[PDB]
Design a protein around this ligand. Structure first.
Ligand SMILES: C[C@H](CCC(=O)NCCC[N+](C)(C)C[C@H](O)CS(=O)(=O)O)[C@H]1CC[C@H]2[C@@H]3[C@H](O)C[C@@H]4C[C@H](O)CC[C@]4(C)[C@H]3C[C@H](O)[C@]12C
Ligand SMILES: [Mg+2]
Ligand SMILES: [Mg+2]
Ligand SMILES: [Zn+2]
Ligand SMILES: [Zn+2]
Length: 1362
DNA sequence: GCATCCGTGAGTCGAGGAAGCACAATTTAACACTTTTGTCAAG
DNA sequence: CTTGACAAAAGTGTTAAATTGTGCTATACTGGGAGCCGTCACGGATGC
């Protein structure tokens, strides 16, 4: 079957053991001598499979005949060695270990279910405090001990073993207390030592024993290696032992009868216990635990009266019960797993739901968070105790290989070292437990085992990272393998390295057609090698494919017919050319290769702008689509000649450029003379006669009788363009001379160059009548006029004729720029004579500013501002003087022509070359008082050059630090919008948006018509939601708006006939998981309605992010866009009115306050003194209308005005940044991203549903839920619109595969696993990860099942059946 | 409300690759021999 | 198709090296060692 969904869930110890083919019991990897895997180790063949196909370890089975067999000698299955990549083992832990993901991922899942703080969980898990599981009637400091109570180590010891203390008596002294006498706190035991607790006092080591013989206080000395064998106050018959020793020579016995008295204790032991004397055998033993009433000895004659630990003292023949309780308190994951197994999720949910009615919001907020985790376990079917590991899975050995390098050295992965540590510690703990080691040692081993598991799963998350000894590089754990820019997702699943790919330097191919590229022969030989081998065999070049491959291995073995065969292999095929960074989809284009000699790829000039490529050393990659589908898609969808318009704005993107523009501008610009320039005559005979006398120039404007003409128009009248260009060939007239020509039945007055341009377009499109309508004859052909020509040709003729026109424009532009005579010399940077006059004026005004400043008429700051204004004004005047000189005296100056035509440079750069450099800014942001008064032609001074370097470095640093921000933003946009596709023709919605044609300019306090570019960016290629009647023209509902329609609407607005246009937009589309054809509009790249199955989400992200690097960075620029897409609260946020009413300013010397007064309401706003109010007294302000200047908080705007208002604000404010930079971007692309930001709602009233108040879900889901509920007469859910940024919107998506591959992988995976989330594979990222066909383009269900059949077969099938 | 803390994020290709010994237990190697296998000429 | 010599071609069985695993030292010894350090954003969680 086909995979349709991917589910993630917790694995139980039972399931982990079902995966494993065996337990890894030893940390041995391979044998150091034979290099074979060690038995029971991390590379065992008996577990993970054979190392070579169909061959066991012992070498008894060596063929596939014994397939599925297991050798009895070695136990290795006889099968394929590839199973060694898929077969898992496991490690059986001596004690449970918590999974760090469900502990350290804030908020922890284990803590939330158990109601334990982050610190409390850590203290228990890492053996710092005990947690009570059974108090057993234990009292701690007069208070009963309760379950789930945390005990410190001292508290546990006091409760479990009691209170006791040893006081060392000074040598020689004798204690004031006897052995076995009860003491009270503060009592003095010895002359200088006082006890601190009440209990039985016991002599530890009596140094002197004083017996009393009866006939006599004989004494004996006690040494450390001796022990007394009798209790105090004992009658000893002559002969009985008294003090024992290692050597019987020093052993002490009693000569006669007496009473033994012990004196001089080494120390005093105070123990809180009850002493029970006995005579017969005791029924208990040391270490036993007893309760009140339990029999101790003498058949019930002596019984316990208190809880404690029973210890029998045979020397004193008494039973001591050290008062203590048998409390059950545990540390580590064994205790936590005990609590997690005892949880009743049914009971917990009921209690949480009851607490969901608490008046406090914090209590309900906490209850909702707990119940969301509880609900996840209840719904998914997972068990909370599965978050603690009893068996640890072991990765297949081939994914953590230990390989021998070409030099014989061994390389291994970090996972083997992490596995060995866990196995070594696990084995050691088992040995310690078998030895009955003390609790201190066991606790250290268990704490180390927990840490070893943590390092294996997520190294460095908790504590110091584990490093391999001899280095400080942290070991790479399982979490590091999956997360980050170098993880599995982004490095191996979302992108890959591919076969049939090449690379080389790119050079310009001017002779190529738009759809052609120059592919080196030696690159194409390797790229198409499998195809070439087949063709070589098909011909007689080689006998078979293997012989052909040997021929190609040696360069000197390649014959000349191999190149003929290669030419046949590539016939008709295309290749993909790729340049990094791929900012938009035009960074990959398909071309038909032309095999060329050399080693560099030839690139067509007209596609360089789309690739952002130049020829300073750039490189491109080459890719070969292999199947018929890949070749068809590349030739139809990705061919360069088919993508001529911009998907972002719909304007031409393959169009005339630097040299092409210059050559076409040069011929279409007319000459202007000054010799005559005014003389008036009576007849043309006189006017021409003066021309022969030299009094008037050919192109000097004159007036013959009443009309203004020139000599050329009167002297040279040509019957047709061919005659005019024949005269140009003979040198009679120039291309720039204005003469009279007869063309298309009209007696035009133009230059031969403009008539030549008209013929160029006419022949390219092969239509003289249509060509005449496409061009503007009476202007020089600059970048904008040539861009309009391409767009109009595309509309009227299509891709094929437009690509031909682009090829003809490129050819003639190149040809005419070579012979025109364009060059740059030092004298071409003409210095206006007005610069000297302006600088002298600035010196006088500056000297006058200093004079006033000396007189005190102004301060330092106003002196500083006035200086900057003076030099800012002078720079503008010098710029104007520079360009006024060019257009009057040097209209054909190379710098003027390049800037005027759009080929190169702008007025700012020309001023620095010809005028003055201007003012420079300090590193701190201030501007130097003294400007750079020299241009580049004159040459800066050393100090001026250094001062100018401050800004140059700052610009370079801004550019470097701006690429990372723009690239990061694009990735956020792609991940939030990647699932949006055009999925149907129409969603049936009746909603729409009104695009405003007028903008409320506040300075003039009135409405003013918006700019054409702004209106076009919001109207072009959009479906009219309602019928519109303007200027006698009826634009019916459902009509796509072309540029002509948009211009008609702008003309209607100019006449006061329409203020806004109702259109369909992605904001109001009702399609699920995408938009419909009617809500999107045109495919701006083709100027026609978008086709179903297009990934408009990806296009929108690339359109927005591509010009991201052109946004200034230095609340403005790219930072402004990033904040708007993240829905961040501005620091200097404006103040808006929550309700509508009249403003009443109460400004006072004490404070500033603004009052919005209504019929009954009076809202008060305390604004700061430095507040730039934009509303004065007596103004009727509506809800959400700003009162103070600044950026509006989108979340405050959403609450006050609504979803529509915030959506309009976000689109307009984002477009302002791009417009300020000259970038043209359709509103559709922003509205698609904004539609994703506003995709969620918050539950406020659950109604008759299981939703929790404050729960965040998708708007589509709640709407579907509400309609279902209403269908059955149940109260619907009341929700609240929600706004979130692109980052948060992408992470809260319903597909965990796409969210896990974005960022926050541990958090995404931990929540998905607990909930048992199932991924339906809806968007593009999920299908790319699994290598499936994406549900867009040719992979969309709308077009995927189309069938093609010819007439003959169709008739046979219909005939053969009917 | 609020600071303060921690945790996660920050463009793309390319090119650069320090015991020592004793002894027991286990494994490996080298014989030995018999037992297939592969040829041979026939027949 | 056999039919008997033949000869390596291989395997089975001891034996002895060669390798590997393991236990044991008796003056008295009793709590570690390396960072050190120029960024900025955000949530989100808690200390209350
Ligand atoms: C009008 C004329 C044919 C008219 C007829 O058949 N009689 C056609 C036939 C071949 C055409 C030229 C070539 O393509 C090369 C080149 C292609 C560039 O794109 C534009 C310039 C060039 C020089 C073209 C100009 C023009 O277009 C020509 C002369
Ligand atoms: Mg370059
Ligand atoms: Mg004439
Ligand atoms: Zn085997
Ligand atoms: Zn729609």
């Amino acid at each position: 079957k086909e995979v349709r969904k991917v589910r993630i869930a917790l694995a139980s110890p039972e399931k982990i053991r079902s995966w494993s083919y065996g337990e890894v019991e030893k940390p041995e990897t391979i044998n150091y001598r034979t290099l074979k895997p060690e038995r029971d180790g991390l590379f065992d063949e008996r577990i993970f499979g054979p190392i070579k196909d169909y061959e066991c370890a012992c070498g008894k089975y060596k063929r596939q005949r014994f397939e599925g067999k297991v050798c009895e000698r070695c136990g290795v299955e006889v099968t394929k060695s590839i199973v060694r990549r898929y077969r898992m083992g496991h490690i059986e832990l001596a004690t449970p270990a918590a999974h760090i993901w469900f502990v350290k991922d804030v908020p922890s899942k284990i803590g939330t279910l158990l109601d334990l703080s982050a610190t409390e969980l850590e203290q228990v898990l890492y053996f710092s405090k005990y947690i009570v599981l059974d108090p057993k009637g234990a009292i701690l400091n007069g208070v009963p001990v309760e379950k789930r109570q945390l005990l410190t180590d001292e508290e546990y010891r006091e409760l479990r073993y009691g209170k006791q203390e040893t006081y060392p008596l000074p040598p020689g002294v004798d204690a004031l207390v006897k052995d076995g006498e009860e003491v009270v706190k503060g009592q003095e035991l010895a002359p200088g030592v006082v006890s601190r607790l009440d209990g039985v006092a016991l002599y530890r080591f009596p140094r002197r024993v004083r017996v009393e013989y009866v006939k006599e206080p004989k004494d004996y000395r006690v040494q450390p290696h001796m022990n007394v064998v009798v209790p105090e106050g004992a009658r000893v018959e002559a002969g009985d032992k008294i003090v024992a020793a290692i050597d019987p020579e020093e052993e002490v016995i009693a000569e006669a009868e007496g009473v033994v008295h012990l004196h001089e204790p080494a120390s005093i032991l105070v123990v809180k216990a009850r002493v029970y004397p006995f005579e017969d055998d005791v029924e208990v033993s040391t270490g036993d635990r007893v309760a009140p009433g339990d029999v101790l000895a003498d058949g019930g004659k002596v019984k316990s009266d208190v809880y404690g630990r029973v210890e029998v003292d045979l020397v004193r023949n008494v039973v001591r019960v050290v008062e203590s309780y048998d409390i059950d308190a545990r540390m580590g994951a064994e205790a936590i797993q005990q609590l997690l197994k005892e949880l009743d999720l049914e009971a917990l949910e009921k209690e949480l739901l009851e607490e969901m009615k608490h008046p406090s919001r914090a209590r309900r907020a906490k209850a909702r968070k707990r119940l969301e985790v509880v609900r996840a376990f209840l719904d998914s079917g997972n068990r909370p105790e599965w978050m603690i590991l009893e068996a640890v899975p072991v990765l297949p050995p081939d994914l953590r290989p230990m390989v021998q390098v070409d030099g014989g050295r061994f390389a291994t992965s970090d996972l083997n070292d992490l596995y060995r540590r866990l196995i070594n510690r696990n084995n050691r703990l088992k040995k310690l437990l078998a030895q009955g080691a003390p609790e201190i040692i066991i606790r250290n081993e268990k704490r180390m085992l927990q840490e070893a598991v943590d390092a294996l799963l997520d190294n460095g998350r908790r504590g110091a990272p584990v490093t391999n000894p001899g280095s400080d590089r942290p070991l790479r754990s399982l979490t590091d393998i999956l997360s980050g820019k170098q993880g599995r997702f982004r490095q191996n699943l979302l992108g890959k390295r591919v076969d049939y790919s090449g690379r080389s330097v790119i050079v310009v191919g001017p002779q190529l057609k738009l759809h052609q590229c120059g592919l080196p022969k030696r690159m194409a030989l390797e790229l198409f090698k499998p195809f070439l081998l087949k063709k070589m065999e098909e011909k007689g070049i080689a006998p078979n494919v293997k012989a052909a491959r040997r021929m190609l291995e040696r360069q000197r073995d390649i014959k000349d017919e191999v190149w003929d065969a290669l030419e046949e292999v590539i016939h008709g095929k295309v290749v993909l050319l790729n340049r990094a960074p791929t900012l938009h989809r035009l960074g990959i284009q398909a071309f038909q290769p032309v095999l060329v000699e050399g080693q560099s790829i030839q690139l067509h000039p007209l596609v360089c702008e789309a690739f952002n490529a130049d020829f300073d050393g750039d490189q491109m990659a080459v890719h070969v689509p292999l199947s018929s589908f890949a070749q068809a898609e590349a030739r139809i969808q990705m061919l360069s000649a088919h993508n001529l318009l911009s998907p972002a704005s719909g304007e031409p993107l393959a169009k005339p450029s630097r040299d092409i523009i210059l050559g076409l501008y040069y011929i279409t610009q007319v000459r202007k003379e000054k010799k005559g320039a005014g003389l008036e005559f009576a007849t043309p005979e006189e006017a021409l006669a003066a021309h022969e006398r030299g009094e008037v120039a050919l192109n000097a404007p004159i007036k013959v009788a009443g009309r203004e003409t020139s000599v050329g128009r009167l002297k040279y009248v040509f019957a047709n363009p061919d005659e005019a260009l024949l005269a140009v060939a003979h040198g009679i007239v120039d291309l720039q001379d204005v003469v009279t020509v007869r063309y298309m039945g009209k007696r035009l007055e133009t230059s031969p160059g403009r008539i030549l341009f008209a013929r160029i377009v006419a022949e390219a499109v092969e239509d003289e009548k249509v060509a005449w309508e496409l061009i503007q004859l009476d202007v020089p052909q600059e970048k904008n006029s040539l861009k309009d020509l391409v767009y109009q040709a595309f509309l009227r003729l299509g891709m094929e004729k437009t690509a031909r026109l682009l090829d003809a424009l490129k050819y003639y532009g190149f040809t005419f720029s070579t012979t025109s005579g364009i060059t740059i010399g030092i004298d071409d940077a003409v210095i206006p004579e007005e610069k000297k006059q302006y600088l002298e004026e600035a010196d006088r005004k500056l000297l006058q500013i200093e004079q006033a400043y000396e007189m005190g008429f102004l301060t330092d700051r106003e002196r500083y501002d006035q200086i900057l204004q003076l030099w800012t004004e002078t720079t503008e005047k010098v710029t104007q003087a520079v360009f006024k000189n060019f257009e009057e005296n040097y209209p054909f100056n190379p710098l003027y022509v390049m800037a005027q035509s759009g080929a190169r440079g702008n007025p700012q750069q020309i001023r620095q070359l010809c005028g003055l450099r201007g003012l420079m800014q300090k590193p701190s942001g201030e501007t130097f008082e003294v400007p750079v008064r020299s241009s580049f032609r004159e040459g800066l001074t050393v100090l001026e050059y250094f001062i100018s370097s401050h800004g140059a470095r700052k610009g370079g640093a801004d550019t470097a630090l701006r690429t990372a921000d723009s690239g990061y933003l694009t990735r956020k946009l792609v991940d939030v919008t990647h699932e949006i596709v055009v999925r149907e023709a129409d969603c049936g919605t009746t909603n729409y948006i009104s695009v405003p044609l007028f903008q409320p300019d506040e300075v003039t306090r009135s409405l003013r018509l918006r700019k054409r570019a702004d209106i076009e960016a919001g109207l072009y290629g959009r479906v009219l939601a309602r019928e519109v009647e303007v200027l006698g023209v009826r634009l019916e509902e459902g009509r796509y708006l072309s540029m002509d329609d948009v211009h008609l609407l702008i003309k209607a607005a100019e006449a006061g006939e329409i203020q806004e246009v109702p259109v369909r937009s992605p904001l109001t589309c009702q399609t699920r998981y995408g938009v419909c054809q009617k809500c999107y509009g045109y495919d701006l790249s083709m100027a026609r309605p978008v086709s179903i199955g297009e990934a408009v989400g990806i296009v929108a992200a690339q359109s927005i992010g591509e010009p991201g690097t052109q946004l200034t960075m230095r609340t403005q620029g790219l930072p402004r866009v990033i904040e708007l897409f993240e829905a961040r609260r501005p620091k200097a946020k404006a103040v808006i009115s929550e309700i509508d009413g009249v403003v009443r300013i109460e400004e006072t010397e004490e404070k500033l306050s603004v009052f919005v007064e209504s019929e009954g309401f009076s809202k008060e706003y305390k604004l700061p003194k430095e507040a730039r109010l934009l509303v004065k007294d007596g103004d009727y302000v509506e809800a959400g209308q700003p009162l103070t200047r600044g950026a509006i908080d989108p979340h405050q705007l959403l609450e006050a005005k609504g979803p529509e208002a915030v959506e309009r604000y976000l689109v307009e404010e984002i477009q302002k940044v791009y417009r300020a930079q000259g970038v043209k971007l359709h509103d559709k692309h922003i509205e698609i991203v904004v539609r994703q930001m506003m995709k969620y709602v918050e539950v406020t009233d659950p109604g008759d549903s299981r939703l929790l108040e404050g729960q965040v879900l998708e708007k589509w889901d709640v709407e579907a839920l509400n309609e279902r509920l209403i269908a059955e007469g149940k109260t619907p859910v009341a929700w609240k619109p929600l706004l979130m940024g692109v980052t948060k919107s992408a992470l809260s998506t319903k597909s965990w595969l796409s969210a896990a591959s974005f960022q926050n992988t541990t958090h995404v995976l931990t929540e998905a696993a607990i909930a048992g989330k199932k991924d339906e594979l809806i968007g593009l990222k999920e299908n790319v990860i699994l290598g499936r066909l994406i549900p867009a383009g040719t992979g969309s269900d709308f077009v995927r099942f189309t069938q093609v059949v010819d007439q003959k077969t169709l008739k046979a099938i219909e005939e053969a059946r009917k």
